Amino acid sequence: AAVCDICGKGPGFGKSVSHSHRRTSRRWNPNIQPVRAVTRPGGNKQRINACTSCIKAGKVSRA
Amino acid sequence: GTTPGELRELTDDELKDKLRESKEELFNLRFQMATGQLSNNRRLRTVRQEIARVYTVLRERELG
Amino acid sequence: ATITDPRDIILAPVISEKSYGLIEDNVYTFVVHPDSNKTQIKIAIEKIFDVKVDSVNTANRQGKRKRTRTGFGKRKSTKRAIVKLAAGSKPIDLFGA
RNA sequence: GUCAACCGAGCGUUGAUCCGAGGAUGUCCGAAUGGGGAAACCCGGCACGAGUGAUGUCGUGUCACCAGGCGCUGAAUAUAUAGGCGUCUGGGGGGAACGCGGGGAAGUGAAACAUCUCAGUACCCGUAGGAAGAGAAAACAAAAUGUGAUUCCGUGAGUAGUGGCGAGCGAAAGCGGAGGAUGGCUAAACCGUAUGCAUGUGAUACCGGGUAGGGGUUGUGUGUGCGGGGUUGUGGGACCUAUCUUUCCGGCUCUACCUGGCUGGAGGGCAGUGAGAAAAUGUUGUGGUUAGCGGAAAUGGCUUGGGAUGGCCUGCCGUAGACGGUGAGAGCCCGGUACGUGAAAACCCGACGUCUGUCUUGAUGGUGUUCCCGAGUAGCAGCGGGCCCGUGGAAUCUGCUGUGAAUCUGCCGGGACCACCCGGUAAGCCUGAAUACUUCCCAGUGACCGAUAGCGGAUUAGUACCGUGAGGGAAUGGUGAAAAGUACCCCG
RNA sequence: UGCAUCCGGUGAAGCCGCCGAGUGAUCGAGUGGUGGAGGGUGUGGGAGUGAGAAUGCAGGCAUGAGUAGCGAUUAGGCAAGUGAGAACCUUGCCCGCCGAAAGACCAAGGGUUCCUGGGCCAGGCCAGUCCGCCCAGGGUGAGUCGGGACCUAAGGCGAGGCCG
RNA sequence: CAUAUAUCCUGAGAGGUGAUGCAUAGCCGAGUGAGGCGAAUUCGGUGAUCCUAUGCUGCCGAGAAAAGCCUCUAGCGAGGAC
């Protein structure tokens, strides 16, 4: 739920900064949604994980 | 024993026959040391090298 | 090419007080290749001496560990096959007593 | 072969032992891969052989998983997909350092400590290479008519700055050098063609003119693939349209005929294992590496001595007086050195050709407009990273979540921002030399150690030994010139 | 260690003495003995350059000291032998101890300790002719026993796979 | 149709066989010890924590799996079974 099967997005790593400026490690996870990909318009759906960026760009077809 | 030059003209059958011939001698030699009645130690060395010579000649003809 | 020969299996006889006693009852004991099996020697010995073999018994011997100055050396392990000839009983003269 | 000899046996001028190069054999474990397993030991299938009166038995092959091609097959289910088969090519593991991209502490300093430092260090992960990374301006610069890809050294500079402005941290511009390739190729707009999905007023439409024939270069669309076309910042390029124009032939530009283009086949250049395409093939080079060989001159005299290489005195070589050895300090005794010579074969560098590709069906310079110039990208916003810069007025670079443009009077940079000016032309990709390293191999060097030193290891060395395991981990060199290592007798 | 000089198998360094010397660290190219192969001096250069102590490290050796101990709750004795050597070895005859063991057979564990011949500087808490010690040779025989080739439990590994 | 000590299965043990063999108390010379011969072997008493017994009888705390053996067809079959 952090690596897209199409674009290979990865979770960015960073430091959460508090009011007292205490740096604590954390990650920025991609918005990766479960999608039923229809590779061929015939209509056999396969289950994959695709980032919300790839859905918007139309890289996966839900037919 | 036998120089490779003369071994490189026997047909395949003669080499194989010579090969089982020598293994008779090697087996006989091995029993004589265990009994203890054989004096010429180096006879073992010549026989073992003789077998290797025949194998090499046979192996060359399979590819060379 | 590789040519097999039953004389590969049988290395040499073993000479000892026990072994000579067994010969009197027509039982010969050899030192064989460590990876042979009772059926293989029985076939091999029949082919070599052209005699009828009744049964074969084999045992594994662990080499003695002899102390030396440089270190603790260990001799070679071996397998012994104690083969009993059948009633036809052609004495093996090549054994050389 | 050796510690390391003693016995028994043999080889060698018909060339042994030795040294170099290429082959053959290479049990079993190990990524271990037929199945299994407590690594080096148990059990097999299939085919071909060998062997018994036949089962038993023995050899030679072959049988793991995954990925990618390729051919057959296509479940529930109809198209078809998953999946199943058969077959070809690949992976998997190891390695001392150096590279690149990720993850990332604490002791410690701050005379406490959380921001900060230690430090993007130690360690971990994924990955190559002989080097890697970076690289051909959406760059610096500051009005100079300047530089002109990257990388790596020296300066700039412990400065400008940054910092509980505490401890500390710390650039760049410019200038001087190393290397030379300021190198290359694409995508778009247009054409031609092959298609796949549609459709067709299925006709007056598809080709430049004219003559005519025709009803499909489908009439029209579109997407994909492939050949031309183009690679640019004084914007460039497509279309359009004027001037000159360095081989022959053929078929196409719906068709045949006179005019403009497309493509094939023969002269001529131009390049090639390269970044600019790739696989080979010969010939050659006293070119190189992997064994070696030659190589001058004192048995000199006298004295000390067990021994001369010591002392004294005579010669001699020297392109050789480097270094070792030989009974004590040796250029002339030995191995060698100076200086020459040596390759059957294998490998490596070149070079000349077969061979491969490209230009010639082509170029040169001119005029005024429409189309193109890399999209979920740039920009903006929220939360972070990192830059001298700790969020600050915070530019440039970058990650995640939203929002989300233009195609040249366009877009981005010139430290918030705005206007003017200047530079450049992002969202495509390759690129040697300068540079870092040494597991290993060859030749050397030391105002380095000389046995409690130097490697932990001059000797059984990661051995003995300790621990269940990760792991910890020692001590021991010297007779003499030669073994001539005390025959024989006496006490025991 | 640069450079310049002198000594040395007719005997250097090192070590042990005698006789002396300097205001100190120290000196002796003054000399005897041991020794067997390198040393001294002048002037420069560079130091892993001076230990009495860190409950400092490694090796050797003292004091305690010929002292404590010699590892149960059973117990030995005599005759003979071998032997250079005998309380401890062998043989015989007595005595005693265990006898749900201190007897007999295994699994795990060990790995040649088992038997024969030989040895008595090392070890045995003494000596030892003996030995679980040292050396050489020998020994382990399965269709039916405990296992594999037959089967599963807990559990481990795990084609594809899901998750990360 | 059956309640039979009917029938069948299981099964300690007694009995025969294995056994004219083996072995033993002892007897001989012989001596490291080799060798030879070798008698009687009935009745009871006691008696198990072992066998019948994975049984039987009670109880609640409700007491491994698979191969194996048997059977059934599906399926192979002109040879096959004893």
mmCIF file of C-alpha atoms in Angstrom, chain A:
data_model
loop_
_atom_site.group_PDB
_atom_site.id
_atom_site.type_symbol
_atom_site.label_atom_id
_atom_site.label_comp_id
_atom_site.label_asym_id
_atom_site.label_seq_id
_atom_site.Cartn_x
_atom_site.Cartn_y
_atom_site.Cartn_z
ATOM 1 C CA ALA A 1 0.000 0.000 0.000
ATOM 2 C CA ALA A 2 2.965 2.253 -0.647
ATOM 3 C CA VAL A 3 4.296 1.146 -4.058
ATOM 4 C CA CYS A 4 2.212 1.631 -7.193
ATOM 5 C CA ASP A 5 2.320 -1.277 -9.622
ATOM 6 C CA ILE A 6 2.448 1.004 -12.692
ATOM 7 C CA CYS A 7 4.597 4.077 -12.037
ATOM 8 C CA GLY A 8 6.616 2.599 -9.172
ATOM 9 C CA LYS A 9 5.938 5.474 -6.789
ATOM 10 C CA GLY A 10 7.727 5.274 -3.465
ATOM 11 C CA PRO A 11 7.124 6.673 0.010
ATOM 12 C CA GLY A 12 9.153 9.800 0.585
ATOM 13 C CA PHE A 13 11.073 9.913 3.850
ATOM 14 C CA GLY A 14 11.247 13.022 5.989
ATOM 15 C CA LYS A 15 11.304 14.457 9.509
ATOM 16 C CA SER A 16 8.212 15.550 11.395
ATOM 17 C CA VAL A 17 8.981 18.879 13.058
ATOM 18 C CA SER A 18 7.275 19.799 16.316
ATOM 19 C CA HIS A 19 6.774 23.182 17.950
ATOM 20 C CA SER A 20 9.934 22.724 20.012
ATOM 21 C CA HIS A 21 11.695 21.850 16.739
ATOM 22 C CA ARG A 22 12.194 18.224 17.737
ATOM 23 C CA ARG A 23 12.918 16.355 14.510
ATOM 24 C CA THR A 24 11.253 12.936 14.389
ATOM 25 C CA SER A 25 11.455 10.615 11.395
ATOM 26 C CA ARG A 26 8.354 9.799 9.353
ATOM 27 C CA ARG A 27 7.258 8.850 5.842
ATOM 28 C CA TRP A 28 5.095 10.404 3.135
ATOM 29 C CA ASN A 29 3.087 7.526 1.708
ATOM 30 C CA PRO A 30 1.617 7.711 -1.800
ATOM 31 C CA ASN A 31 -2.149 7.732 -2.088
ATOM 32 C CA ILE A 32 -2.453 4.226 -3.509
ATOM 33 C CA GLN A 33 -5.961 2.939 -4.085
ATOM 34 C CA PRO A 34 -7.065 -0.604 -4.955
ATOM 35 C CA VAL A 35 -8.313 -0.721 -8.533
ATOM 36 C CA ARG A 36 -9.868 -3.385 -10.762
ATOM 37 C CA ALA A 37 -7.891 -3.093 -13.975
ATOM 38 C CA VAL A 38 -9.575 -4.145 -17.215
ATOM 39 C CA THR A 39 -6.654 -4.715 -19.571
ATOM 40 C CA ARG A 40 -8.837 -5.685 -22.533
ATOM 41 C CA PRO A 41 -12.333 -4.262 -23.181
ATOM 42 C CA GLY A 42 -13.555 -7.872 -23.143
ATOM 43 C CA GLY A 43 -14.000 -7.509 -19.417
ATOM 44 C CA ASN A 44 -11.812 -9.720 -17.232
ATOM 45 C CA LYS A 45 -10.893 -7.537 -14.266
ATOM 46 C CA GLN A 46 -7.607 -7.956 -12.412
ATOM 47 C CA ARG A 47 -6.933 -6.473 -8.990
ATOM 48 C CA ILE A 48 -3.958 -4.113 -8.654
ATOM 49 C CA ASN A 49 -2.828 -1.105 -6.611
ATOM 50 C CA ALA A 50 -2.563 2.184 -8.477
ATOM 51 C CA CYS A 51 -1.629 5.637 -7.274
ATOM 52 C CA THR A 52 -4.300 8.309 -7.430
ATOM 53 C CA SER A 53 -2.058 10.168 -9.861
ATOM 54 C CA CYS A 54 -2.161 7.242 -12.289
ATOM 55 C CA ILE A 55 -5.945 6.965 -11.998
ATOM 56 C CA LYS A 56 -6.366 10.653 -12.833
ATOM 57 C CA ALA A 57 -3.998 10.421 -15.796
ATOM 58 C CA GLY A 58 -6.062 7.503 -17.084
ATOM 59 C CA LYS A 59 -3.319 4.883 -16.986
ATOM 60 C CA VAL A 60 -5.756 2.248 -15.670
ATOM 61 C CA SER A 61 -9.078 1.429 -17.333
ATOM 62 C CA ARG A 62 -11.983 0.357 -15.121
ATOM 63 C CA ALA A 63 -14.275 -1.218 -17.707
#
